[PDB]
Amino acid sequence: ALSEIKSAFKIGFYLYLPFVVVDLVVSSVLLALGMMMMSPVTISTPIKLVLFVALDGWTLLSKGLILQYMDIA
Amino acid sequence: DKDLLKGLDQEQANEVIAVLQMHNIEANKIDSGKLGYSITVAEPDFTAAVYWIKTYQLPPRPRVEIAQMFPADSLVSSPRAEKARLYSAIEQRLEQSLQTMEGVLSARVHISYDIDAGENGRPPKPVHLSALAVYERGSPLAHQISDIKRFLKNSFADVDYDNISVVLSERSDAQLQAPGTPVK
Amino acid sequence: DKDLLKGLDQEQANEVIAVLQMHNIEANKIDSGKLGYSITVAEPDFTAAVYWIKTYQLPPRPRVEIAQMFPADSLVSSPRAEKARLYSAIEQRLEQSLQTMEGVLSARVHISYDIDAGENGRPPKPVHLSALAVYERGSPLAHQISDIKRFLKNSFADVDYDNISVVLSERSDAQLQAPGTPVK
Amino acid sequence: DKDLLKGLDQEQANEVIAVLQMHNIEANKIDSGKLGYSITVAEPDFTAAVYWIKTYQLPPRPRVEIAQMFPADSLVSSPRAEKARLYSAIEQRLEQSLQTMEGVLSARVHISYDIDAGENGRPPKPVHLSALAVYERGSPLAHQISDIKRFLKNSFADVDYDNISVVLSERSDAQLQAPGTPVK
Amino acid sequence: DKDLLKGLDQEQANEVIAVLQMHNIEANKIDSGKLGYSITVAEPDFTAAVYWIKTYQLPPRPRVEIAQMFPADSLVSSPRAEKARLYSAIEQRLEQSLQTMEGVLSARVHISYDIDAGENGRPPKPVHLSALAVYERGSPLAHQISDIKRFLKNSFADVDYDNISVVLSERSDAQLQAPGTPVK
Amino acid sequence: AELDSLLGQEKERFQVLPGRDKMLYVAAQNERDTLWARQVLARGDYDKNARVINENEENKRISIWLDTYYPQLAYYRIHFDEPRKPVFWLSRQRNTMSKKELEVLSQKLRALMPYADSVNITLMDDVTAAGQAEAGLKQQALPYSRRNHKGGVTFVIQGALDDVEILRARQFVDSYYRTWGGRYVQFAIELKDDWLKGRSFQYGAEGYIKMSPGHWYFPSPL
Amino acid sequence: AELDSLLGQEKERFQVLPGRDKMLYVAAQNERDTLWARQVLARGDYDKNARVINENEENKRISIWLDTYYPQLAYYRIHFDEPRKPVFWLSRQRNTMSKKELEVLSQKLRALMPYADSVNITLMDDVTAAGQAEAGLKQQALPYSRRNHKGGVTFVIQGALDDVEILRARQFVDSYYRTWGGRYVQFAIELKDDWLKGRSFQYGAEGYIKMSPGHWYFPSP
Amino acid sequence: AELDSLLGQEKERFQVLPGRDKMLYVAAQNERDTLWARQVLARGDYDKNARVINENEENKRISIWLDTYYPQLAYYRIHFDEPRKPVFWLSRQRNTMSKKELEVLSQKLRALMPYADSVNITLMDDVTAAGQAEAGLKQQALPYSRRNHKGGVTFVIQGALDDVEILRARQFVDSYYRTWGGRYVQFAIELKDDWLKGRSFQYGAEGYIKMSPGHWYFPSPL
């Protein structure tokens, strides 16, 4: 069990990495305009949510996680 | 000198002249500058040259490969779009390797592609190969079929000798003499 | 004086000339600086030179390799791409090491590609090899087939002697005399 | 005076010269400053020299090594790319150490790449080596196959004397006399 | 006065001259400031000197080390890239200590590398060594196996006397007289 | 310019024969020198008429005339070592010809080849043609299976052969057809895998194939 | 100039023989000198006619004539150690020739070799030809199997040979083909992998191989 | 421009012999000095013709002539310690030539070498050839397996030998091949993995039985 919490926490960081690029590239285009004060979270979450289902995310990590364990499909 | 074709390619005009000179009519590879090449035939040879253009389907289309519609420039690529690009480079490298044998002028190799087995619950099927070849004449081309099946057998994981079909043929007659201008 | 191919590079022009010169026609290679080379023949030799361009599929296309379909400049690299870029550099190093033997002028090695064994929990299959070679004439090329098998057997994990197929052949007859200018 | 190749390299021109001087035809290494070297032969010796360029596949391509397909400048580096960059430096250092033996002129060593075996839960398989060598003539090259096996048996984890295959040969007859200019 | 190499290094030109001077041909080393040295040879000796450039694979590549594939300036260092940079400096320090013995002119040591024992629960295995040496002539080179084996056996944690492989040899005959100018 | 000087520098590979029908035959010995000589006569830098002959082409051409004017003939090959007096190898134990019509055939074959002066007809024995074919097939350690029927034998070489048994079985057949012809004895090399690949079977006169541990298949008696 | 001055500097590796049909013959001794001397005559710096002969392809040329005009003839090799009087190694126990037709065969071989003056024909036994091939194959300690039949003998070398024995075999077959040729005795080196590397088995009369603790393999005799 | 002056400064490592066929021979000693002397005669800084000979390659050249005109002859080596008078070591117990056909062989060996004056033929014994190869192999404490047969003898050294036994065996075979040559007795050094260095036993009901020497070896778990 301690080897599975270790093997899960370093997969979730790799998953974490593209999103940080997204909410760092949408928060910096507001400061290029005169938008220094508006909150970028309410703009970050739809542009992060319509990209993950359009690129078929939840059927890409559900396949890639079961391929570690068994001969799926 | 009525014109027939224009806007062609360097290799598209060398096939039109090679077809028309086989049927006793001459042609002219007139350069058009920045437009390309243009083939002009004589006036008595215009009816025959139009009929052999329609019959032989000239000018030739560019030859297609499977890895041309799954380009490697996209930011994401499916495993379906990565196995078709791997197999399309294997079936070209095997075609380049078959031409260096003793007597072969040209060849063509096909491999069975795999689509549904990446996601369906079935294991992937066996691999099937198919080859064509054109041999220099004077060759006993019944014995050459055992040197191509032996070379193509263990270049993959596991194929049988029943899953390989080789259909080869000797080349045509030589064309050496000039066609001849119409006596007018 | 008629031109048949322009814009060719150096390696393409030296293989168009070497094909035409063995069929008793004389070609002329003309440099043009930035626009590349160009090849011109005489007037009686044009009907035959177009026929050998069509038959031999000249100019030669560049030779393709599997490592070109998966470049190392991509931001993400699948394990199917890293294994495809590994086996294509092993089969290039093996054919560059076969030319350092005694009598070999050219060689070409193929490896069976296995890519789907690593993605899921299936065990890998055996690995297959296949080679071609061109030898100097005067050599007993029946006993030269055991050294390429012994060299190729333990360059991988575990192969047998039934998964290696070597097809080798002596080189063609030497062309040393000049073609001959047509009198008129 | 006719040009064969141009835009070559310093190490690429001495191989074309070393091949043409073996077959009784002269060559001239002309430097062009920034554009590279160039090699010209005489007009009676142009028909044979194009034939040996086509046969011997000149100019030689640069030698490929496995550490070039996985460069060190990458932002991420999988353990597949660290083991491939490691084994590709061991088989370069071992073939640099084989050239310092008594009588060896050149050599080449291949390691069996097993990259996924240590990753998977299955135990890693045995490692196989293979070597080629070119010896100075006058040597008893049947007894020297045991010193190379003794040298590279203890350079890895667990190799047997059955997983090492050494294929070696003596060098060619020396070319010391001048070719000779064509007299007309 | 025909040049054959230029742009060479200081230690590269001393390896080209000492090879040519062994075979009765003399060469001139010419400095060029920033563009390196250059070696020229006489006209009757150009045919032989090209043959020994091709045979001995000159100019020499710089010698490779395993610590160059894993540079220390990288921000992320694996345990594999730290264990390989450790062994790649123990391997150089041992061959630098082998040259200070009584009669050794050159030496080369090879440590067996272990990588895939640290990341998984597999235990490490016994480490193997291998050596090469060149001794001054007139020395009993059969009794000096036990001194190198005794020195190497206590520089690691667990090695056996049948896990160490020493292959050594005496040096060549000295070249003391001048080549001589080719008169005509 | 003469014809022997309009060809290449090496005046050893070609041989010009003065024909009897006011022509001039050049005799090459392979298909690369035949195209080397046909390019000269096709570009038209020679005034008179000339033809290029060969060994395999002329031996294929004369069998079309002989397959119409002399059917049911047992012959092997026409040999052209000296191209002025060719040798016609005829069978002995298969013909019904006396001494008169052999001279008639030797005059009608002379009229088909204008470069020749006389055609020599020698009768080769019929048993040594298959004795050399079997003894040369046993020295190469090749497995084979001889089938005897009237007017021709047949050697079948099948199974999974390795790379030495293909290269040894091809250099012998091409060296035997060159000196005997493929009229009488025929080799059948056939590289295929083993029949009934991974199936256990019960051979001999009442046979079945076990498709599974519980599946019997009853084809032809294996 | 003369032909021996248009060749290389060292006038030892080429022998220039005067013909009989007003032609000149250059006798090289391998393929590298044959292609060295053919570039001279091919580029055309010589007035009259000349040819380049060899050891191998001259033994290949007069076997094409000798399988048309003299079939069923048992011979070994035509030796050219001195090119003006070659030696013809004919067989003794397989020919039916008297004293006269050996002289007619000598006169018909002299017409085939215009550079020669006489042809010396000797007769060798077929016992020493197959005896030196078995004693040399036994001295190198190689595994072999002899198969005798009429008009030929073959030696089969099989097994999982190492890298020393495939070099000892090649240095012997190459040294034997140079002397006797492949007309009588033929070597067949094919190498296979071994099954009983890690298996336990019983050898002898009742032989089997245990491929597993629960798996027997009975090989066919 | 004399030939002894066109060589190096030290005029004691070469030796120029006058020939009978008007040609000067330079007798070098090893392979490194043969190319040092061949470069001089290749660059062409000498007027007349000359040849360079060697002890290792005049014995390889004279055996090509000898196994065509005198087959089934038993001999060992030709020694060139005095190059104007060599010694030919013939076998006494394996040939029955008389005195006259030994003087004809000595004159035909003389006409092959134009630098010699008289070839001296000595008959060496055949027991001491295989006797000094066994007595020199027991002195280095090496494991071996003597195999006698008709007209030759072979010594096989198998096993997982260490680095001292490889050096002493390779250092001894090179000192025996120089004296006797590999025509009669041959060594078979080969490394494989078994701690019993060549010998093998089988165990039943009485102790151990020394097995026959064979090709199959038992790999050693140890």
One-letter amino acid identity for H208? Y
A73 contacts B120? CB cut-off 8 A = yes
Shared-domain flag, residues E49 and E69: no
Half-sphere exposure of H10 (CA within 13 A, CB side): 8
- Give me the residue from C140, C147, C177 closest to G42, CB to CB: C177
Question: C149 in helix, strand or coil?
Answer: helix
User: What is the C-alpha to C-alpha distance for residues E3 and E37, in angstroms, rounded to an integer?
Assistant: 11
- Please answer whether residues G150 and G157 qualify as being in contact, where contact means their C-beta atoms are separated by less than 8 angstroms: no
**Residue G117, H or E segment:** none
Check whether residue G190 and residue G130 sit in a common domain. yes
Same domain, H117 and H89: yes
Q: Read off the tokens for F13.
A: 């590979």
CB contact under 8 A, D150 and H189: no
Contact yes or no for C44 and F162 at CB 8 A: no
CA F194 to chain centre: 30
Q: Verify that G98 and G46 share a domain, yes or no.
A: no
Chain G residues in contact with D144 (beta carbon < 8 A):
none
Q: Which two tokens stand for residue F199?
A: 């199936």
Cβ contact B115:B80 at 8 Å:
yes
- Check A70 against C122: CB less than 8 A apart: no
Cβ within 8 Å, pair C154-D130: yes
Q: Are G72 and G105 in contact (CB under 8 A)?
A: no
User: Is D18 part of a structural domain of the chain?
Assistant: yes
With respect to residue E120, please indicate whether it lies within any of the assigned structural domains: yes
Are both E10 and E53 inside the same structural domain?
A: yes
- Establish if F205 belongs to a structural domain: no
**CB contacts, 8 Å: B86 with chain C:** 66, 69, 80, 84, 113, 115
Q: C-chain residues within 8 Å CB-CB of D117?
A: 157
Count of other CB atoms within 10 angstroms of residue H142: 19
d(CA G84, CA C168): 37
Distance of alpha carbon H147 from alpha carbon D104, whole angstroms: 33
Q: Which two tokens stand for residue F72?
A: 């049911």
Query: Domain holding G166: CATH number?
Result: 3.30.70.1770
Pairing mode, strands G87-91 and G120-124: parallel
HSE toward the beta carbon, residue G204, CA cutoff 13 A: 4
Candidate from C64, C119, C130 with C-beta closest to B96: C64
Closest partner residue to C86 (CB to CB) among D71, D84, D128 is D84
CA F90 to chain centre: 14
Shared-domain flag, residues C82 and C152: yes
- Domain membership of residue C175 (yes or no) is no
- G129 and G143 both lie in a single domain: yes
Domain match, E157 and E135 both:
yes
- Which residues sit opposite D15 in a β-bridge? none
Q: What angle do CA H56, H60, H66 make, to 5 degrees?
A: 140
Distance between CA atoms of residues C45 and C27, nearest Å: 9
The Cα–Cα gap between C179 and E94 comes to 64
C144 and C79 share one domain: yes
Residue B2: burial class (beta carbons within 10 Å; 0-12, 13-18, 19+): exposed
Q: How far apart are CA C88 and CA C68, in angstroms?
A: 9
Is E180 part of a structural domain of the chain? no
Pairing of strands B129-135, B164-170: parallel
Rounded to whole angstroms, the Cα distance separating B47 from B35 reads: 25
CATH number, domain containing residue F68: 3.30.300.170
Same domain? For B115 and B163 the reply is yes
The last residue of one of the domains, among E9, E41, E60, is E60
Interface contact G141-H151, CB threshold 8 A = no
β-sheet with E164-170: strand ranges across: E104-111, E129-135, E164-170
Query: Strand E2-8 relative to strand E37-41: parallel, antiparallel, unpaired?
Result: antiparallel
Q: Sign of the CA dihedral H159, H164, H166, H168?
A: negative
Tell which residue, H163, H161, H220, has the closest CA to residue D151: H163
In chain F, beta strands by DSSP E: 16-18, 24-27, 51-53, 75-79, 87-91, 120-124, 145-149, 152-157, 185-189, 200-201, 209-212, 215-217
Distance, C-alpha D116 to centroid of its chain: 28
What strands, in cross-sheet order, belong to the sheet with F87-91?
Answer: F75-79, F87-91, F120-124
Number of domains, chain F: 3
Residue H74 lies in a domain: yes
Give the distance from residue F47's alpha carbon to the nearest chain C alpha carbon, in angstroms: 11
Residue D128 lies in a domain: yes
Partners of residue F164 in chain C, C-beta under 8 Å = 142, 145
Q: Is B16 helix (H, G, I), strand (E, B) or coil?
A: helix
Q: Within a domain: residue D183?
A: no
Question: In Å, what is the CA distance from B31 to each residue of B39, B50, C6, F125?
Answer: 9, 20, 11, 67
Subunit contact B146:F191, Cβ cutoff 8 A: yes
State the resolution, in angstroms.
3.8
Query: Experimental method used, please?
Result: cryo-EM
- Domain membership of residue G189 (yes or no) is yes
Tokens of E115: 């990588």
Domain co-membership, F119 together with F59 = yes
Is there a domain that residue F107 lies in?
A: yes
Which residues of chain C make contact with A15, given a CB cutoff of 8 A? Answer: none
Closest chain H C-alpha to G9 CA, distance in angstroms: 7
CA distance G131 to G180: 12
The C-alpha torsion from E76 through A17 and D67 to D110, rounded to 10°, is 100
Q: Which of H92, H124, H156 is the last residue of a domain?
A: H124
From H48, H50, H65, H55, select the one nearest H86 (Cα to Cα): H55
Q: Are A43 and A33 in contact (CB under 8 A)?
A: no
F18 and F78, same domain (yes or no): no
Pull the structure tokens for residue C60.
Answer: 């030669």
Last residue of a domain, one of F91, F108, F124: F124
Q: Measured in whole angstroms, how far is the alpha carbon of residue C156 from the centre of its chain?
A: 23
Inter-chain residue contact C178 with F8, CB threshold 8 Å: yes
* Crossing angle of helices H127-138 and H163-177, rounded to 10°: 160
**C75 and C155 share one domain:** yes
In chain A, what are the helix, strand and coil shares in percent, each to the nearest 5?
A: 70, 0, 30
The verdict on a CB contact (< 8 Å) between G9 and D177 is yes
Q: At a CB cut-off of 8 Å and minimum separation 6, what does F44 contact?
A: B177, C44
Cis? peptide before C59, omega within 30° of 0: yes
H196 CB burial (10 A radius; 0-12, 13-18, 19+): middle
Neighbours of chain G (3+ CB pairs under 8 A): C, D, F, H
Residues of B in contact with C130 (CB under 8 A): 151, 153-155
G29: CATH: 3.30.70.1780
Residue G8: which of D44, D165, D177 has the nearest Cβ? D177
Distance CA D133, CA D106 (A): 6
Distance between CA B172 and CA C100 in Å, rounded? 39
Name the minimum distance, in Å, from the CA of A73 to any CA of chain B. 4
Q: Work out how many CB contacts closer than 8 A connect C with D.
A: 120
Residue D12 and residue D27: Cα distance in Å, rounded?
A: 14
State which amino acid sits at residue E71: P
Tokens coding D101 = 């033996």
Chain D residues touching E71 at Cβ < 8 A:
72
Q: Which of H59, H52, H60, H6 is nearest to H32 (CA)?
A: H52
Among C60, C86, C110, where does a domain finish?
C60
In this structure, the answer to whether residues F110 and F60 fall within a common structural domain is yes
C-alpha–C-alpha distance, residues B154 and C152, integer Å? 14
d(CA D133, CA D168): 5
Place of tokens 């007018």: B184
Cβ(E3)–Cβ(E39) below 8 Å: yes
**C32 vs G208: CA distance, rounded Å:** 75
Residue H216 located in a structural domain: no
Chains F and E touch (3+ CB pairs under 8 A): no
Structure tokens belonging to residue G42: 């091919």
Cα G181 to Cα G189: distance, rounded to the nearest angstrom: 17
Nearest one of E97, E168, E92, E99 to E137, comparing CA atoms: E168
CA C146 to the chain's CA centroid: 23
Distances (CA, A) of B177 to B183, C45, H120: 18, 9, 73
DSSP helix/strand/coil, C161? coil
Q: How far apart are CA G50 and CA H90, in angstroms?
A: 44
Contact F139 G186 (CB under 8 A): yes
Give CA–CA dist C118/G66, Å, rounded: 62
To 5 degrees, how large is the angle CA G146–CA G150–CA G153? 30
Q: Which of D7, D47, D61 has its CB closest to that of C176? A: D47
Residue F221 lies in a domain: no
The verdict on G36 touching D (C-beta cutoff 8 Å) is yes
Q: What single-letter DSSP state applies at residue D30?
A: E
Best of E23, E24, E147 to disrupt the H interface by mutation (most H CBs within 10 Å)? E24
CB F107: neighbour CB atoms within 10 A? 11
- Give me the DSSP letters along chain H: --HHHHS-S-TTS--EEE-SSS-EEEE--SHHHHHHHHHHHHHT-SSS-EEEE-TTTHHHHHHHHHHHHS-S--EEEEE-SSTTS-EEEEESTT----SHHHHHHHHHTTTT-TT-S-PEEEEE-SHHHHHHHHHHHHTTT---EEEEETTEEEEEE-S---HHHHHHHHHHHHHHHTTT-TTTEEEEE---S-SS-S--EEE-SSSEEEPPP-S-------
Strands (E), G64-172: 75-79, 87-91, 120-124, 145-149, 152-157
Q: Residue D137 belongs to what domain range?
A: 61-170
What's at C116, amino acid-wise? D
Q: Distance between CA H115 and CA H111 in Å, rounded?
A: 9
E67 and E21 in a common domain: no
Check whether residue C55 and residue C83 sit in a common domain.
no
Q: Which residues contact G51 (CB under 8 A, 6 or more apart)?
A: F12, G23, G24, G25, G26, G41
| B87 and B42 in a common domain | no
N-terminal to C-terminal alpha carbon distance within chain B: 13
G208 within some domain: no
Helical residues (DSSP H) of chain C, grouped into ranges: 10-20, 46-56, 79-98, 145-153
What span, in angstroms and rounded, lies between the C-alpha atoms of F13 and G78? Answer: 24
F57-63: long-range contacts (C-beta < 8 A, 24 or more apart)? F58/F113, F62/F109, F62/F112, F62/F113
H or E stretch covering D176: none
| B118 interaction partners in chain A (CB closer than 8 Å) | 73
| B52 falls within a domain | yes
Number of CB atoms found within 10 A of residue A40's CB: 17
| DSSP character at residue E98 | G
D77 vs E contacts (CB less than 8 Å):
76, 78
Task: Provide the residue range defining the domain that includes F79.
Answer: 54-124
Interface of chain G against chain F, CB under 8 Å? 41-42, 44, 49, 51, 64-65, 67-69, 71-72, 147, 149-152, 154, 156, 186, 188-190
Q: Note whether C127 and D113 are within 8 A (CB).
A: no
- Which stretches does DSSP call E strand in C31-170? 37-41, 104-111, 129-135, 164-170
Residue of F nearest to B176 (CA): F42
Torsion sign over Cα C51, C57, C58, C59? positive
Nearest residue to C129 (alpha-carbon basis) of C149, C146, C145, C115: C149
Q: How far is CA B52 from CA B5, B13, C51, in A?
A: 13, 14, 17
Alpha-carbon distance A65 to nearest alpha carbon in chain B (angstroms)? 14
Question: Are C72 and C131 in the same domain?
Answer: yes
For the beta carbon of residue F3, count every other beta carbon within 10 angstroms. 17
Chain B: touching chains (3 or more CB pairs < 8 Å): A, C, F
Residue where one domain finishes, among candidates G99, G124, G149 = G124
CA atoms within 13 A on the CB side of E179: 23
Q: What is the C-alpha separation between D175 and E55, in angstroms, rounded?
A: 11
CB of G170 closer than 8 Å to CB of G204: no
Q: Residues G3-8: contacts with CB within 8 Å, 24+ apart? A: G3/G46, G3/G50, G6/D180, G6/D183, G6/G40, G6/G45, G6/G46, G7/G37, G7/G40, G8/D177, G8/D178, G8/D180, G8/G36
CA distance A60 to C78: 13
Burial of A54 (C-beta count, 10 Å sphere; 0-12/13-18/19+): exposed
Q: Residue type at G120?
A: N
Q: Specify the number of domains making up chain E.
A: 2
Report yes or no on H203 lying in a domain: no
The answer to whether residue H178 neighbours chain D at the CB level (below 8 Å) is no
Residues in Cβ contact with F35 at an 8 Å cutoff, skipping those fewer than 6 apart:
B174, C23, C24
* Residue F13 at interface with chain C, using a CB cutoff of 8 Å: no
Q: Do H118 and H59 sit in the same domain of this protein?
A: yes
G35 contacts in chain C (CB < 8 Å): 174
CA C70 – CA C81 distance, rounded (Å): 6
Q: Is residue C179 part of a domain?
A: no
